[model samples]
Target: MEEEAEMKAVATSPSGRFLKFDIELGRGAFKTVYKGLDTETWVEVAWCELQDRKLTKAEQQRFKEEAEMLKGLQHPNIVRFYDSWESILKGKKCIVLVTELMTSGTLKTYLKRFKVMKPKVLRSWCRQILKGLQFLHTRTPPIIHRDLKCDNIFITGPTGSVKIGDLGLATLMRTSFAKSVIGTPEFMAPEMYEEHYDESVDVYAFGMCMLEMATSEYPYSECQNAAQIYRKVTSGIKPASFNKVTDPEVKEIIEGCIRQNKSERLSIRDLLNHAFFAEDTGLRVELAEEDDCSNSSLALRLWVEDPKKLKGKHKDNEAIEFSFNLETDTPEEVAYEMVKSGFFHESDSKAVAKSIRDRVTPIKKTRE
Candidate 1:
């Protein structure tokens, strides 16, 4: 018989307890995640499925299977799992899985805030992402993330490094009898639609994600839907390569990832050791300590410590603050004002604005 006690209260004893609030994170499909807290830990819990249909025996079985699979694997770049169980909430039964909460949010949010950076900087981000993918590919039976989009790649904290997220679509094949096909269409390798697939399929998607990082745009962003994208991808219409690519080696690494022929691609171990990434971006990744800032993050803070000091034209210590007429101007419009004020050219203004647009998300772009 299923345990007769309240899981929330019982589980908290062995595990750090968390209080749940009915807050939503905006983009999840089915279950609304209540922001949860326990000790120094905080996480989002989604017991709901995108399918409004009640869970069948098979779905529940899969849930147990996935959770068990996650319990077995541990990698630094991959999101870590804690404990999970079914519980009563608002008079309904829901499966709650608790894991790490990446404070920096998703890579999409990061790109929207910071925009493009120097190629060297962008390279570090790519190296970490690849490192995670390498870990995923090396699993004993291997696993493939059906959906590996920008939204699924989360930042550690405000200053934390990158880590992979969202394992609901993760497929693991430990035996010949155990095979399944359920993944996000956009990131799925074409082999997935076939009768069966291997780990190389994920390597294909990892390559696409690398390109997305280099250019702050989706590879198939122009396509109307997945079928069109699949057609293009299988037909060899790759995403636009980076213009003014600083390093030929990194460019080659990206190319090797998305190679149309699955047989020709590099293994994750080889990819990890590849010279293209150059000493794997030389990072000093540490658990966010004391003040909870990564070394690179602290360095970035110091780098931007003086926006005003560099501008001798302004005597004010405050670099500059320009408030826009929200009633008459769109955020884009005010961006143009900053451009016209001689801060930067029109193109440069748009580029800079796009960089920081998402960090300040939920702020109105156009006032009614």
Candidate 2:
């Protein structure tokens, strides 16, 4: 009888513009996500039904805050928020949130399907996640994703389009600090346990996620329970799963993200520039030397591209490619700006400047 009742609840779609619920995709402590369709527009969606039989004021307020946060956040690397409404399921009033359905499900499940992921694909997914974090951090007040485990990271179908979702634990930065000891135990940063941290907490979680993705084992898999995981995390001990990560490059990136000290962790921008992503991300500045005596100074044409829009050896259709010319007193000045502006690493910038100086020859004039 209980199973039948649950089936009935799953079949009944949330009341909306002719939305029809199909299979029960998944369920959590607070909600059940279903595969559904908008009969009106024939759009595929993930129907999320809150499971509170007797909704409390606090629960409703949290739902409302999630809706508000999703509504304002718009990014390719972040899940799209569509609509939310009050509905009745299993004879109980609840909230239903509709968002675009991802065909590939959560990163946790996706990683489970394969013993090993292709290096290129894994790096691409990591880049997409960093891009999402960059967008969230660059917001007016910044958004710190308190929970950033593999379960919250999602992937689209065959193309492997990655997006960050589940904003339930997300909070806007008020003063560069959040004193909430809330997050998955294994993935939590050292400072997060202390109840004081900033956006770097997410970076730590991302590292754990990467470690899990690289190896099919969960973070701290050797630990028997949350207490053990907590003890190891606070003790500055690397998780047993970290041993499974054999790839040196993958290890480097993950270690950088999960540094014990929050200040030592890499920023999203710095992570993007890390050697792990240097060759793959294709971050290069094109240089041209004009052999004109009229202009002794170096001219730089800078083209900025959105890192998220970077596809496999190609830019996305909506890539932000804008070129601007800068006239500097010397080639050295151009390289200095490149490093100072954080556009390129200091070594790469210096090499680029040296190449420019070596390539151009002084202009020669002939008498007419």
Candidate 3:
């Protein structure tokens, strides 16, 4: 008799679609994020599978809330949601949330890798994050991302795009404020510890994030415990670690963000106009001729071959250059450069650059 072959099975969703799970991306208290692929669609996704199939009533409700919130949110700076379904993994029913995989990993990891980032780079990150926050704050009901930290922010390597993720604690603003003593102790605002606050709590958290980005250290790194940190925060005592941030403008911005008084804290609108992001604060743009190509199509062809080469030749033998003037050149400037290079029409440059960024955004488990 022929030897019986052992049976092997793959996990599938309720709709009977197969999910190819790869290495574990990260684990939390109740869910584990995995680098997963949709065999049917051939799309790489971050599969956030709930760990406990036997969750309590409250746990199940929270999981459902997160899924519903993610499904409705759609923004460039926010992590994109693909699908959600219950799947059977290891013979247990689990809730799976599929989102666009971010390859560069958490902003915290990225910051640590670079050690000390330039103020311009830091400003760029802050700008993108604030943009996300602005979107949340402007919604009809005004969604509040209770948890905002470096680890909750994701970065795409090539485009240097930063996106906000981890909306598990997000809630809609039916009224003006929220009541909950939640979130990381170090990043929480004074009102947060009192179990009462509004979306401005996120503003406070953003400041702490900026402080961490500028210093590569938590706001109250010296504090021995949560109580100590809370005491210092509520008492209006700035962290001694703030001394490490030598940039006067950056220091001022950080201080403004972590203000003890909620009403006096910098709003998202105020941050966009802050001196920290001023062009003269620490950024300049310089352009030079690289080479000349026949036309725009030719330039695009070269870009296809090596997208990394920002400055290149355009058609009609005209030289087009792209210097990484990140400090001064905003997305608008890049769109202008695309038009000047003859690579795209003035109207199309904006859309084209955005598309390029979306395409270049590396997926998780791929190249750094």
Q: What is the C-alpha RMSD of each candidate to the true structure, in Å?
A: 14.7, 13.9, 13.3
Tens-place lDDT per residue, model 2, 209-291, is: 88987777778878788778878888889987786665556788888888988899878888888766644332333223432
Please give the TM-score that candidate 1 achieves against the real structure.
0.61
lDDT of 1 by residue, 88-110 (tens): 44554445666666665788777
Clashing pairs in 2: none
The residue-by-residue lDDT of candidate 3 on 249-282, one tens digit each, is 6778888888888888888898898755654311
Q: How many times do residue backbones clash in model 2?
A: 0
What do the candidate models score in CA lDDT, each in turn?
0.53, 0.64, 0.64
Task: Output the TM-score of candidate 2.
Answer: 0.63
Instruction: Provide the clash count, candidate 3.
Output: 3
Show the colliding residue pairs in model 3.
294-315, 294-316, 295-315
For candidate 3, the per-residue lDDT at 18 reads: 41
The estimated TM-scores of all candidates read: 0.61, 0.63, 0.65
TM-score of 3: 0.65
Clashes in each model (backbone N, CA, C under 3 Å)?
2, 0, 3
Error of 3 at 296 (Å): 52
RMSD from true fold, candidate 2: 13.9
